[PDB]
Ligand binder design. Structure first.
Ligand SMILES: CCCCCCCC/C=C\CCCCCCCC(=O)OC[C@H](COP(=O)(O)OCC[N+](C)(C)C)OC(=O)CCCCCCC/C=C\CCCCCCCC
Ligand SMILES: CCCCCCCC/C=C\CCCCCCCC(=O)OC[C@H](COP(=O)(O)OCC[N+](C)(C)C)OC(=O)CCCCCCC/C=C\CCCCCCCC
Ligand SMILES: *[C@@H]1O[C@H](CO)[C@@H](O)[C@H](O)[C@H]1NC(C)=O
Ligand SMILES: *[C@@H]1O[C@H](CO)[C@@H](O)[C@H](O)[C@H]1NC(C)=O
Ligand SMILES: *[C@@H]1O[C@H](CO)[C@@H](O)[C@H](O)[C@H]1NC(C)=O
Lengths: 203, 915
């Protein structure tokens, strides 16, 4: 902390770029909201997805119901040529407005020093952290503005959160549903229930 | 750079101390003329101290003026012991003709006219007499003094018409008179008369009426008079008829007037009888008649308007350095009712000692005073503002100076005051005070420093015994002091001993003066801010002092200690309190003195003891018949260096040897002849006395110029074998490892480092040379060069590097070492002083700011200069170009865009819901 720097630097070059990046990271969110579209694609695809999800949940938790019923639907889905799967046949935006602005800055706020980082850095990285200076004697903790900008960028990622084919798919479902066990899995609940007591104390 | 061009630099220029002058140009247009000790000629403007043209020629005594004369539009100057004669124009500084004379002594000069014009001028040089024309210069004729070996011909006169007289005296035997006449060259009758009572007529007597000589004989208390045209066996009038006694131990003298060399002088004249006794008298053929006598007069001048002839008289009034001046009409004695000026000086012991007059014909008059110290004043016939202007010409010879920091604001004072529960409540109180101050909110006695201080009050001391204080930005003398009884040649040392960082404690500085004839010495202590002696009285030195050091160890009042060494090898410690004495009884044996005498060429080195005495420790000589020490240098104690090593090309390190206690010694030969001349260098340690390096550079003689910085050395000299100036540079490197990297005791290093060096050439000559400085040593270091033309040059040290590729390898290529620059260049793009040239430039001073990117420069010679330098482009100040309007036109753009695209997405989304 051996140097004495103009306070006008603090005022007019530091706070501007702890602000700008914050408001730009907000605007990016709001504009992304305003940008995204949404198709009205088709009745066919939506229906097909819905039934595929019915199949998924069948394979997942089809083990709380009578066995014959599970097997009945499994047959309605797998039965040769009746089974449903055997009859139906058919970054950049992030990075770039952040890399274009660092350039503007380093073209604008160039010929001076900004601040100090309290952990010692490596020397080879000097010529790109200062970028205006012609001392080639300072330690590299004394940086230019661009580094402050990028540091702010990476540091304010986590503080916006706090303030805010068809046929093959069908056949794969069919194949993954062929191998399936009912496993009814309800066949001791009676005893388990009447094992210790009934539990209710909120009346 | 317009800003620095007009915000922080400046240049005062002076001429020195007036010997001669000449007023009363045609009416007197705006101007007057002087001819000073420093060989200058100036043409000042008589409404305000300001120069039209200087024509400074030569510092050293081969241009020193010996006489001066104004022929109403032009001037005449006789320099170099009678040899050279010049005429100027008095309008633009434009010379019109110069010539040279034979060898002589210039007994005197006069301006002769034959009957109605002034065509010729006359010169007397103790052997002959010369007579030249005015406009041409080309000699008219010379005659020879009849005997010219014992007479000491001391005076010329010409009462207008016809002819010329030449007058000489042997001390206590006789005088001879001679007459020549124009356009012959021939010696008219010469007269001799015996007069064994005078011993000179240089400053004794002068012609009064149309041939008439009158000289005083204090023996017989009378006046021996002579018509010089129609009488010999000179007459005598006893000065007892008039109660007009002489003084006891005086050489009384005579003051005539001759406003026209074509008409005779006037029959009224002045006598200086005693120091403060002046008499006006009048001469008829035999009847002397007193008109007035002045008993309390120090100074008087004659003057003459178109017809009238007047006498200005000076007097003290009663005291408090208050003088009065009055006019008198010479023909009568009658004082003129009006025209009493009354003025006063500000200093304590200071006397006018000189008075010149200018006269109007409204009737007006303006006076010029060269008071003692060197000061100059121009007084006008007014009441309210009587001093039209004042000119402080003592600064034309500066000796040593310093730059001191200003005092504090209130904020910082109470802040210091701010610094268990007592701690907390103290803090709170001070905070609440500053708070109330903020709420409430929203020249010698009111000045204080600013952030990144650049104001840096200056203290300069002067060969005439006059101390100053200046602001260092638009330099305005704020205070002055005068310490008396100071010879022309003495020796000063100026030490700073407590600065402005401890609010209740007042600063102080200290000054050591020698006398140079008796060896006596004096210690004056003061406060550099207001200019006042301090209350504490310094001790009285009995013996001749030799040297002194400053010893930054403090006392309980934050003051350094200033050890002084006697001639009988006994120490004196100025703040001699008990605390300091115990500190010394502890740490004395780590304090060493080194002394040097060039007469016999020997060096010595002493150390302290528990008590204050000195035991000789090392001793060393140099033969004074082949070596003659020129100067000795040592590192500035007030420097701090950042890096202990220099990174090599392949990420290796080369460590450097600092040796605080080192010193450089430079010598030159006795057998001066340009085949066998040589310059010697020695590098010594102050503690032990061992020579690190001992070098010789042959065929080189010249006046040298040296700099000895942190681990490098530079010296400039002159090569007689290719008749060119040269630079030579040294660097010291220990090696690749560190030897007790934390301590550096000089009693522990056996192994001596490796010297690198190199020699370049330089296309010009040199005057004072110095190096930049700033605390923390970070930024690049430059060399400030004073050329003879007055321009300053900033040279980068990194250009003078002994490790320069010299047909590079690839390591040097990587190390970007700029191989061996031939003929180190001079282009006028790095001159500080664009049109602010300094004339003689005996010296330079460089001081550090608080901003670490600026250095404060002061060039002192016959004329001052002051500025700031930026070795590395001011990296810690914002840009001096900032656009504060764009940035306040951007944030609002973004804030309103954010509000916009907040209220503009909530809505589109809501509308997506209720489609
Ligand atoms: C260092 C600076 C960074 C962080 C300091 C910590 C304080 C953070 C508060 C500002 C952040 C903010 O964005 O503040 C919004 C809230 C609005 O209330 P909330 O609904 O988010 O409550 C919280 C309940 N949760 C989490 C379930 C929604 O303000 C608040 O509560 C905070 C109240 C502020 C107290 C003064
Ligand atoms: C000064 C005027 C500030 C204008 C900016 C402003 O007013 O809007 C941004 C935030 C307040 O918006 P919000 O945090 O309530 O979240 C709103 C998002 N929503 C609806 C999902 C909760 O400004 C802030 O907090 C200021 C944060 C201070 C950092 C500088
Ligand atoms: C000394 O001279 C100054 C000049 O203004 C004057 O003010 C002061 O009164 C004088 N001293 C005395 C004792 O009158
Ligand atoms: C270094 O010097 C200090 C002081 O002279 C001494 O105490 C220490 O032992 C030395 N160490 C080495 C490694 O030279
Ligand atoms: C010095 O020279 C510059 C240009 O070389 C000029 O603009 C400036 O007015 C000059 N200064 C003076 C005092 O003449």
């Amino acid at each position: 902390p051996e140097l004495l720097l103009d306070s006008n630097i603090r005022l007019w070059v530091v706070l501007p770029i702890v602000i700008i990046t914050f408001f730009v990271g907000m605007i990016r969110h709001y504009v992304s909201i305003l940008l995204q579209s949404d198709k009205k694609l088709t009745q066919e695809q939506v229906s097909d997805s819905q039934v595929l999800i019915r199949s998924r949940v069948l394979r997942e938790n089809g083990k709380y119901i009578p066995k014959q019923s599970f097997l009945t639907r499994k047959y309605y889905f797998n039965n040769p040529e009746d089974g449903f799967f055997k009859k139906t046949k058919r970054n950049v935006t992030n990075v770039l407005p952040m890399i274009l602005i660092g350039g503007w800055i380093n073209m604008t706020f160039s010929g001076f020093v900004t601040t100090k980082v309290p952990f010692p850095l490596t020397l080879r990285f000097k010529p790109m952290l200062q970028q205006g200076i012609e001392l080639l004697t300072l330690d590299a903790s004394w940086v230019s503005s661009a580094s402050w900008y990028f540091l702010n960028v990476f540091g304010l990622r986590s503080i916006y959160s706090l303030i805010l084919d068809t046929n093959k798919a069908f056949k794969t479902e069919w194949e993954a549903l062929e191998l399936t066990d009912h496993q009814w899995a309800l066949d001791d609940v009676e005893e388990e229930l009447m094992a210790k007591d009934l539990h209710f104390e909120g009346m | 750079y317009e800003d620095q061009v007009g915000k922080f630099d400046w240049r005062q220029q002076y001429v020195g101390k007036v010997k001669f002058a000449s007023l009363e140009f045609s009416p007197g247009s705006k101007k007057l003329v002087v001819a000073t000790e420093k060989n200058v000629i100036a043409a000042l403007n008589s409404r305000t101290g300001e120069i039209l043209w200087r024509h400074v020629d030569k510092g050293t005594a081969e241009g020193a003026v010996d006489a001066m004369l104004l022929h109403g539009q032009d001037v005449i100057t006789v320099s170099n012991g009678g040899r050279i004669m010049r005429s100027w124009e008095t309008n633009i500084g434009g010379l019109n003709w110069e010539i040279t004379l034979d060898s002589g002594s210039f007994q005197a000069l006069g301006l002769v006219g034959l009957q109605e014009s002034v065509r010729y001028i006359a010169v007397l040089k103790k052997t002959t007499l010369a007579l030249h024309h005015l406009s041409s210069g080309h000699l008219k004729w010379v005659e020879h003094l009849p005997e010219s070996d014992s007479i000491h011909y001391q005076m010329v006169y010409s009462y207008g018409s016809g002819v010329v007289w030449a007058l000489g005296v042997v001390p206590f035997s006789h005088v001879n008179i001679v007459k020549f006449n124009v356009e012959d060259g021939e010696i008219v009758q010469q007269v001799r008369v015996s007069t064994p009572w005078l011993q000179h007529l240089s400053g004794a007597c002068g012609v009064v009426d149309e041939a008439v000589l009158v000289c005083p004989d204090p023996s017989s208390r009378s006046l021996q008079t002579l018509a010089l045209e129609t009488e010999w066996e000179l007459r005598q009038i006893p000065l007892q008829s008039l109660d007009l006694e002489f003084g006891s131990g005086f050489q009384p003298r005579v003051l005539p007037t001759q406003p026209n060399p074509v008409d005779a002088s006037r029959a009224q004249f002045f006598l200086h009888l005693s120091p403060s006794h002046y008499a006006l008298l009048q001469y008829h053929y035999g009847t002397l008649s007193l008109l007035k006598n002045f008993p309390q007069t120090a100074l008087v001048s004659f003057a003459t308007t178109g017809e009238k002839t007047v006498a200005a008289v000076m007097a003290c009034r009663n005291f408090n350095q208050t003088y009065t001046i009055n006019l008198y009409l010479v023909e009568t004695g009658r004082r003129l009712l009006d025209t009493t000026i009354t003025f006063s000086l500000e200093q304590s012991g200071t006397r006018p000692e000189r008075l010149y007059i200018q006269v109007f014909l409204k009737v007006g008059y303006r006076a010029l005073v060269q008071t003692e110290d060197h000061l100059l004043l121009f007084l006008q016939q007014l009441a309210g503002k009587v001093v039209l202007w004042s000119r402080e010409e003592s600064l034309a010879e500066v000796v040593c100076l310093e730059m001191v920091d200003l005092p504090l604001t209130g904020a910082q004072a109470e802040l210091e005051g701010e610094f268990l529960l007592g701690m907390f409540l103290k803090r709170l109180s001070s905070q609440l005070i500053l708070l109330q101050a903020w709420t409430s909110h929203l020249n010698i006695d009111t000045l204080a420093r600013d952030e990144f201080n650049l104001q840096k009050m200056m203290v300069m001391v002067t060969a005439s015994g006059k101390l100053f204080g200046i602001e260092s930005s638009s330099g305005t003398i704020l205070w002055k002091q005068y310490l008396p009884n100071v010879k022309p040649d003495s020796s000063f040392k100026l030490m700073v001993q407590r600065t402005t960082a401890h609010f209740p404690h007042p600063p102080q500085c200290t000054l050591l003066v020698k006398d140079k004839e008796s060896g006596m010495s004096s210690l004056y202590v003061f406060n550099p801010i207001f200019g006042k002696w301090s209350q504490v009285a310094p001790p009285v030195l009995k013996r001749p002092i030799l040297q002194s050091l400053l010893l930054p160890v403090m006392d309980q009042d934050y003051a350094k200690v200033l050890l002084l060494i006697d001639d009988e090898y006994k120490v004196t410690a100025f703040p001699a309190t008990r605390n300091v004495l115990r500190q010394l009884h502890e740490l004395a044996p780590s304090i060493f003195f080194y002394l040097v005498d060039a007469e016999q060429g020997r060096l010595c080195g002493y150390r302290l003891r528990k008590d204050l005495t000195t035991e000789l420790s090392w001793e060393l000589t140099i033969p004074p018949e082949v070596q003659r020490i020129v100067k000795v240098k040592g590192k500035r104690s007030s420097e701090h260096v950042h890096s202990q090593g220099r990174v090599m090309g392949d990420r290796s390190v080369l460590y450097k040897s600092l040796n605080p206690n080192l010193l450089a010694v430079v010598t030159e030969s006795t057998d001066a002849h340009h085949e066998r001349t040589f310059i010697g260098i020695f590098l010594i340690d102050g503690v032990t006395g061992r020579i690190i390096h001992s070098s010789v550079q042959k065929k080189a003689k010249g006046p040298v110029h040296i700099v000895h910085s942190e681990n490098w050395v530079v010296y400039q000299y002159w090569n007689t074998k290719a008749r060119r100036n040269e630079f030579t540079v040294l660097e010291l490197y220990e090696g690749t490892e560190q030897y007790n990297a934390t301590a550096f005791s000089s009693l522990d290093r056996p192994q001596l480092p490796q010297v690198l060096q190199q020699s370049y050439i330089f296309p010009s000559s040199i005057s004072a040379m110095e190096a930049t400085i700033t605390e923390r040593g970070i930024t690049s270091r430059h060399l400030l060069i004073g050329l003879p033309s007055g321009a300053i040059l900033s040279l980068p040290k990194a250009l003078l590097d002994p490790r320069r590729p010299e047909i590079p390898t690839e390591q040097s290529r990587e190390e970007n070492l700029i191989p061996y620059s031939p003929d180190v260049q001079i282009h006028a793009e790095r001159f500080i002083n664009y049109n602010q040239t300094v004339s003689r430039m005996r010296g330079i001073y460089t001081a550090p700011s608080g901003l670490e990117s600026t250095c404060l420069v002061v060039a002192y010679g016959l004329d001052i200069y002051q500025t700031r330098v930026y070795p590395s482009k001011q990296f810690d100040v914002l840009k001096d170009d900032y656009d504060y309007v764009l940035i306040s036109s951007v944030l609002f753009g973004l804030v309103f865009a954010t509000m916009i695209t907040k209220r503009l997405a909530q809505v589109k989304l809501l509308n997506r819901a209720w489609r």
